[PDB]
C-alpha cells in the first residue's frame, strides 16, 4: 500500500477542469433559481396580505380569505407533488442523500418544475416550512440536469455535480456559503464509504450562487440580531445544560416528526384527493394563524430577532413554542414540499431565549442576556435532531455574526448531539432515508 | 442496499470510551499548549531583559542577541537530531503519516523532544509558529493515552490521534472550528475511508480551547478591529489577488523543499554541523529581532500593524522578502516548529501591498488595504499547504471580519485554483511523499 499512497499523495487535489467549470454553471443556476423562488414565495405572501386589506372590515370574511388563499395554494402544491413527483414532497434532503449513495434516482425533468412551483405554493402560503428543502433538492437536480445535458461521465462528475447543487442550494437559502459546504461534508455525503466528491468543486458552486443571491438580496440580512454581549467563563456550564436539554428533546421531536408522518398517512391513506384536501386544510390553518398570532405560523425567521431581543414574555415564549412544535410537524410530516430546517432554528431560538430568562433571574451575578442563550440554542435543535452540529453552529454563525459566543454555541450543540445519542435518537434525514429505502423493499 | 439501511440506522454512534478519552486528550493537549506558549514567551522575555543589561555597548548587545538565540537554537536542533529525528520541522506531515499507519508515534520521545525543542527554537525568536510543536505534541498526547489505557481498535487509534491534532491546532490559534476543519480537510487519510469520529474530535478541541481560555483570556493573538465592507464591484479584485497567490504558492513550495536539501549538504547528516548551523540561523533571528523585528519572530505582531496600513510600500516589500528568507531558513533547516503561522504573516503583508496599490488605482471603490490584507492572510495557506477551507476559517476565527467572507473565499479559491494549474502540491503531503519515499529507497 505505501507505494500506492506515495503515488496518490503526489496526485492529491487534482480535479478535472471540466468538473470545475461545471460546478460553476451549477452554482450559478442554483442561485438564480434560489432567487426566483424566494421571490415568488415573497410575492405570494404579499398578494395574500393585500387581499386581507381588501376585506379588512368583516373580521370573519377576512379570517376566511386568509384560510382560503392559504388552502388554495397549499393544495395546488400537495397536488403537484402527489401527481407528478412523489419524491419532491417533504424535505428533499433525505432524497438527495440517497442519490449520493446511488440508491435513488434524480428525476430532475420532474422534481424541478414540481418542487419549485410546489413549495411556491406551500411556502408562499405561509406554511411552517423553510426554503432549504425546496432549494437543496432543486439544487442537486440542477446539477444532475447539467450532468446529463453535457453528458459528463464518471463517479466524480455525478457525485460532485450533485453535491455542489446541494451546497449551492443550502447556501442560497441562508445566504451562508461556509455552511453550505460544511453541510455536504458532514451530512449530505455517503456516510460510510469513501467518495469522489471534489471539495474544491463544491466551493466554486457555493460561491457562484452566494454571488447570485448577493446580486439581488444585498443590504438586508435575513436575521439581524446586532452584537450581543459576551459570555464569561463561569457562565459556560449553563450552555452545557442548555445542551443536555436539547439533547433529550432532540430525539423526541424526531419521534413526533416520524410518527405524525404515519398518523397523517392514514387520513388520506395514499389517496391523491384526501391528501390534496388534507393539505389545503393545514395550509389554510396557517394562512389563518398568520394573522391572529403570526409567531406560530410562517417560516420563523421574523421572530428570531424579536425573541433574541427579550421582547417576548415567558408566557408568550412557551406558547409560541408549543404552537410552533405543532404547526411544524403538521406541515412537514404532512409531506408538503419544504424544509423543516429553518423552522428548527426558530424553535431553537425560542427555546433558548426561555432558558435564558430563567438563567438571568437565577443568576444576576452573571449579568446574562437571554439573547446569548437564544443563540446557543438557535442551532442546537439542528444539532440534536438533524445531528449535523458543525453545520448548525456554522449556520448560526454565518447568520447571527456573534463569534464571541463561539464557545457557548459549541458546548450547547455538542451537549445536544451527545444526549441525542445516549437517548437513542437518530439523524432525522438518515432515518427518513432508511424508511424510504426500507419501504422501497418491504413492498416486494 | 440492505447494508446501507443497516448502517444509516447505526450512523453517529461513537463508543463512550472513545468519547471520554478524546476529552482527556484535549484537556492535556491544552495544558501543554499552554505551558509551551508560556515557556516560549518566558524566554523571549528573558532574552529581552539581557539586552537592557547590555543596552549601551551596541555591538555587545547585538552580540548577546545572537548568542542567546544561537545557544537555545542549538539546544533545540540537538534535542531533535539526538533523540527524535521525526520531531524536527513541522510535525504535521509526520502526524499525517501516522493517520495513514505509515509512521510511528514515538510519544515517549517526541513529547519531551518537540516540547523543550521548540521551547528553544520559538523562545529564541525564530520564524516558526507554534502549530508544528503543538499539532504534533498534540497527536502524540492522544497516542500516549491510547497506549496507557490500551484502547483498542482502528477508531480508537485513528480518533485519539486526530483529536490530539485538532486540539493541538486549536490551542495554537485559539481557533476551535479551524482545528476541526483542519483534520477533516487535511490531516485525515486523503484517499480511503476512515474511522475518525468527528464528535470525538470536537470534544477534544473544546476541552483544549477551554484550557487555553483559562489562561489567555482577554487578549486576542491578533486584534484588527472591524474593517470596512466590500462592495460587489470590488470582488474581481480579490480574484486577482488570489491568482497571484496562486502562481507564487507552488514556487514558495519549491524553495521550502529545495532549501530543505541545499541545507542538508551544509551538515550532510552530521549532528554537529546541524546543531551548529542551527544556532547560526537561530542567532541570526535573535539579532534581526532588534534591528528590524518585522523580519524575525512568529510574525503575529506585524499583521495588526500591516492591516492598519501603518507600513509604507517600501517597508512592506522589504519585510516580505526578508521574511520569505528567514522563513525558509528556519523551517527548511528542519528546526522544530510550524511554517503555518509565518505563512499567515506573509499573506497579510503580501495582501496589504496589493491593497495600497488597489486603493490609489481605484479611489472610487473607497478601498481600505486592510481588507485585501485579510483576504490574503490565509491565501498563502491556501496555495501552499492547499487547505483553503481550514485557512479561510482560520483567518475568520482570528480576525472576526465575517463581512469579508466573500473576498476571503474568492481569494483563497483563486489561490488553490492556480496552485493547481501550475503544478504545485500540498506542501505537507509532498513532505510526507519525500519522507515516505526516502524510507522505501
Amino acid at each position, epitope marked *: 500500500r505505501r507505494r500506492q499512497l506515495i503515488r496518490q499523495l503526489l496526485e492529491r487535489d487534482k480535479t478535472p477542469l471540466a468538473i470545475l467549470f461545471m460546478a460553476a454553471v451549477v452554482g450559478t443556476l442554483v442561485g438564480l433559481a434560489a432567487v426566483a423562488f424566494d421571490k415568488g414565495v415573497a410575492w405570494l405572501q404579499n398578494q395574500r396580505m393585500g387581499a386581507l386589506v381588501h376585506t379588512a372590515d368583516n373580521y370573519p370574511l377576512l379570517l376566511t380569505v386568509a384560510f382560503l388563499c392559504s388552502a388554495v395554494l397549499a393544495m395546488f402544491g400537495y397536488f403537484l407533488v402527489r401527481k407528478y413527483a412523489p419524491e419532491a414532497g417533504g424535505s428533499g434532503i433525505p432524497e438527495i442523500e440517497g442519490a449520493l449513495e446511488d440508491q435513488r434516482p434524480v428525476r430532475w425533468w420532474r422534481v424541478l418544475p414540481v418542487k419549485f412551483f410546489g413549495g411556491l405554493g406551500t411556502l408562499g402560503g405561509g406554511m411552517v416550512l423553510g426554503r432549504e428543502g425546496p432549494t437543496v433538492q432543486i439544487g442537486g437536480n440542477i446539477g444532475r440536469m447539467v450532468l446529463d445535458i453535457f453528458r459528463l461521465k464518471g463517479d466524480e462528475a455525478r457525485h460532485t455535480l450533485l453535491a455542489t447543487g446541494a451546497a449551492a442550494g443550502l447556501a442560497a437559502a441562508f445566504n451562508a456559503p461556509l455552511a453550505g459546504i460544511l453541510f455536504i461534508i458532514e451530512e449530505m455525503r455517503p456516510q460510510f464509504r469513501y467518495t469522489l466528491i471534489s471539495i474544491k468543486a463544491v466551493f466554486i458552486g457555493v460561491i457562484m450562487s452566494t454571488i447570485m443571491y448577493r446580486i439581488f438580496n444585498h443590504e438586508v440580512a435575513l436575521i439581524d440580531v446586532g452584537k450581543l*454581549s459576551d459570555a*464569561p*467563563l*463561569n*457562565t459556560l456550564w449553563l450552555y452545557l445544560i442548555l445542551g443536555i436539554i436539547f439533547g433529550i428533546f432532540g430525539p423526541i421531536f424526531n419521534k413526533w416528526v416520524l410518527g405524525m408522518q404515519d398518523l397523517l398517512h392514514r387520513v388520506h391513506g395514499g389517496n391523491i384527493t384526501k391528501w390534496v384536501l388534507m393539505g389545503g386544510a393545514i395550509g389554510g390553518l396557517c394562512g389563518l394563524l398568520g394573522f391572529v398570532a403570526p409567531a406560530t405560523s410562517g417560516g420563523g425567521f421574523n421572530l428570531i430577532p424579536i425573541a433574541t431581543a*427579550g421582547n417576548f414574555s415567558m408566557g408568550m415564549l412557551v406558547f409560541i413554542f408549543v404552537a410552533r412544535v405543532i404547526t411544524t410537524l403538521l406541515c412537514f410530516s404532512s409531506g408538503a414540499p419544504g424544509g423543516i430546517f429553518a423552522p428548527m432554528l426558530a424553535l431553537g431560538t425560542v427555546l433558548g431565549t426561555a432558558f435564558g430568562m430563567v438563567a*438571568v433571574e437565577l*443568576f*444576576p*451575578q*452573571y*449579568h446574562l*442576556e437571554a439573547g446569548t442563550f437564544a443563540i446557543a440554542g438557535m442551532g442546537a435543535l439542528l444539532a440534536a435532531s438533524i445531528r449535523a452540529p458543525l453545520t448548525g453552529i456554522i449556520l448560526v454563525l454565518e447568520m447571527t455574526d456573534n463569534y464571541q459566543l463561539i464557545l457557548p454555541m459549541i458546548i450547547t450543540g455538542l451537549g445536544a448531539t451527545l444526549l441525542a445519542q445516549f437517548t437513542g435518537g437518530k439523524p432525522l434525514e438518515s432515518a427518513i432515508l432508511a424508511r424510504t429505502l426500507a419501504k422501497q423493499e418491504a413492498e416486494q | 442496499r440492505r447494508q446501507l439501511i443497516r448502517q444509516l440506522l447505526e450512523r453517529d454512534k461513537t463508543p463512550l470510551a472513545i468519547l471520554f478519552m478524546a476529552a482527556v486528550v484535549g484537556t492535556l493537549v491544552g495544558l501543554a499548549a499552554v505551558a509551551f506558549d508560556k515557556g516560549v514567551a518566558w524566554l523571549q522575555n528573558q532574552r529581552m531583559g539581557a539586552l537592557v543589561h547590555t543596552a549601551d555597548n551596541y555591538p555587545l548587545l547585538l552580540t548577546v542577541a545572537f548568542l542567546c538565540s544561537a545557544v537555545l537554537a542549538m539546544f533545540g536542533y540537538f534535542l531533535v537530531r539526538k533523540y527524535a529525528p521525526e520531531a524536527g520541522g513541522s510535525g504535521i506531515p509526520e502526524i499525517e503519516g501516522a493517520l495513514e499507519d505509515q509512521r510511528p508515534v514515538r510519544w515517549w520521545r517526541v513529547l519531551p523532544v518537540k516540547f523543550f525543542g521548540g521551547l528553544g527554537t520559538l523562545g529564541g525568536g525564530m520564524v516558526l509558529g507554534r502549530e508544528g510543536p503543538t499539532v504534533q505534541i498534540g497527536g502524540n498526547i492522544g497516542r500516549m493515552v491510547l497506549d496507557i489505557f490500551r484502547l483498542k481498535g482502528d477508531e480508537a487509534r485513528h480518533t485519539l490521534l486526530a483529536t490530539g491534532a485538532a486540539a493541538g491546532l486549536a490551542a495554537a490559534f485559539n481557533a476551535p472550528l479551524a482545528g476541526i476543519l483542519f483534520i477533516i480537510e487535511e490531516m485525515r487519510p486523503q484517499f480511503r475511508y476512515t474511522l475518525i469520529s468527528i464528535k470525538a474530535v470536537f470534544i477534544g478541541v473544546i476541552m483544549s480551547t477551554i484550557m487555553y481560555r483559562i489562561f489567555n*483570556h*482577554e487578549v486576542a493573538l491578533i486584534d484588527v478591529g472591524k474593517l470596512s465592507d466590500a462592495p460587489l464591484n470590488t470582488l474581481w479584485l480579490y480574484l486577482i489577488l488570489g491568482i497571484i497567490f496562486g502562481i507564487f504558492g507552488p514556487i514558495f513550495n519549491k524553495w521550502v523543499l529545495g532549501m530543505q536539501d541545499l541545507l542538508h549538504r551544509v551538515h550532510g547528516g552530521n549532528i554537529t554541523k546541524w546543531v551548529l548551523m542551527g544556532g547560526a540561523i537561530g542567532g541570526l533571528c535573535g539579532l534581526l529581532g532588534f534591528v528590524a523585528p518585522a523580519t524575525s519572530g512568529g510574525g503575529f505582531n506585524l499583521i495588526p500593524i500591516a492591516t492598519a496600513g501603518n507600513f509604507s510600500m517600501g517597508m512592506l516589500v522589504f519585510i516580505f522578502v526578508a521574511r520569505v528568507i528567514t522563513t525558509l531558513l528556519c523551517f527548511s533547516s528542519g528546526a522544530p516548529g510550524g511554517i503555518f503561522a509565518p505563512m499567515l504573516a506573509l499573506g497579510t503583508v503580501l495582501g496589504t501591498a496589493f491593497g495600497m496599490v488597489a486603493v490609489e488605482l481605484f479611489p472610487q471603490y473607497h478601498l481600505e488595504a486592510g481588507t485585501f490584507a485579510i483576504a490574503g492572510m490565509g491565501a498563502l495557506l491556501a496555495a501552499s499547504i492547499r487547505a483553503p477551507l481550514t485557512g479561510i476559517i482560520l483567518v475568520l476565527e482570528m480576525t472576526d471580519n465575517y463581512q469579508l467572507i466573500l473576498p476571503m473565499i474568492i481569494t483563497g479559491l483563486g489561490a488553490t485554483l492556480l496552485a493547481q494549474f501550475t503544478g504545485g502540491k500540498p506542501l505537507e503531503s509532498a513532505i510526507l511523499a519525500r519522507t515516505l519515499a526516502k524510507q522505501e529507497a
Partner: antibody
Framework: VRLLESGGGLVQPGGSLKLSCAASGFDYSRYWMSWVRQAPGKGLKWIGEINPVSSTINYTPSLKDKFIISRDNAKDTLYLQISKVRSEDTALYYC??????????????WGAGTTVTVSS | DIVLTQSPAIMSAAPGDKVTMTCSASSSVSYIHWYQQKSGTSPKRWIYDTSKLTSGVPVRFSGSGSGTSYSLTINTMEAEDAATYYCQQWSSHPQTFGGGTKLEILR
C-alpha cells in the same frame, strides 16, 4: 478612561437629588455602570447597577424607589436619583464601570465621586 | 447577602516587610477582588479574581485564599503602599465589600 460624577452637595432631609456621571475615554455602551457610596469614615456599599441597554437595573436591598439608576448612552452619562433622602444617604458617591476576569464581576474603573450632604 | 470581614481593621508595618491582611466571608465566596484606596482618591482595582494583579500593580502585591478565607499580601511593603484596602466579592449577589484594612507606615 475617565469617570466624572457631579450633582452632589447639600440636600434637605426628605428631599431628592440627581447625581450625574460623565463618562469619557471608552465606549459607554458594552459596559455595565454602577453606583457605590462611602459614608464618612466608613466602608464601601453598592447602590446598584444598570446594563448597557437599561434592560436590567438592580439595586442593593433597599426601599422601593429610594434609588433610581438610569443612563443615557447618547450622553455617555449615568444617573442616580435618590429620594426621601435621610442622613444615611450622606456619603461620597462613586460611579464605576463594571467588568470581570473569569466572570465574577468587579468595579473596573471608579471616578473621584461627589459628596452628598443630607442636612437642614 | 455575604458579609466580608477584613481582619486587621488597622495595621502598621515598616517598609520592606511581609504584610498580610485577611478577608473572611460569612458564607462561601470565590475570586474576590481587592481595591486600594489612598486618602483623598478613588478606590482602585488592585487584585481581582483572588490573585490576578491589575495592570500597574507592583509584583510585591499578591493575593490568595478560597471558600471563606482570602488574603492580600505584600512581600516587602513600600511607602506608597500606605492606604486602605477593600476586599469585594460578587461570586454571590448582591456584591459586598469588606470593612477595609488601613495600612499605615509604621515608623
Amino acid at each position: 478612561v475617565r469617570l466624572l460624577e457631579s450633582g452632589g452637595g447639600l440636600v434637605q432631609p426628605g428631599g431628592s437629588l440627581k447625581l450625574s456621571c460623565a463618562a469619557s475615554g471608552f465606549d459607554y455602551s458594552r459596559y455595565w455602570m454602577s453606583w457605590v457610596r462611602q459614608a464618612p469614615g466608613k466602608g464601601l456599599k453598592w447602590i446598584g447597577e444598570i446594563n448597557p441597554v437599561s434592560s436590567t437595573i438592580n439595586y442593593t436591598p433597599s426601599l422601593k424607589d429610594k434609588f433610581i439608576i438610569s443612563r443615557d448612552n447618547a450622553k455617555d452619562t449615568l444617573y442616580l436619583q435618590i429620594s426621601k433622602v435621610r442622613s444615611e444617604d450622606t456619603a461620597l458617591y462613586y460611579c464605576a464601570r463594571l467588568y470581570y476576569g473569569y466572570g465574577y464581576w468587579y468595579f473596573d474603573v471608579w471616578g473621584a465621586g461627589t459628596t452628598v450632604t443630607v442636612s437642614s | 447577602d455575604i458579609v466580608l470581614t477584613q481582619s486587621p481593621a488597622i495595621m502598621s508595618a515598616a517598609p520592606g516587610d511581609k504584610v498580610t491582611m485577611t478577608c473572611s466571608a460569612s458564607s462561601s465566596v470565590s475570586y474576590i477582588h481587592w481595591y486600594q484606596q489612598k486618602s483623598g482618591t478613588s478606590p482602585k482595582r488592585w487584585i481581582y479574581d483572588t490573585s490576578k494583579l491589575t495592570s500597574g500593580v507592583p509584583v510585591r502585591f499578591s493575593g490568595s485564599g478560597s471558600g471563606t478565607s482570602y488574603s492580600l499580601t505584600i512581600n516587602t511593603m513600600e511607602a506608597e503602599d500606605a492606604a486602605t484596602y477593600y476586599c469585594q466579592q460578587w461570586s454571590s449577589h448582591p456584591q459586598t465589600f469588606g470593612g477595609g484594612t488601613k495600612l499605615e507606615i509604621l515608623r
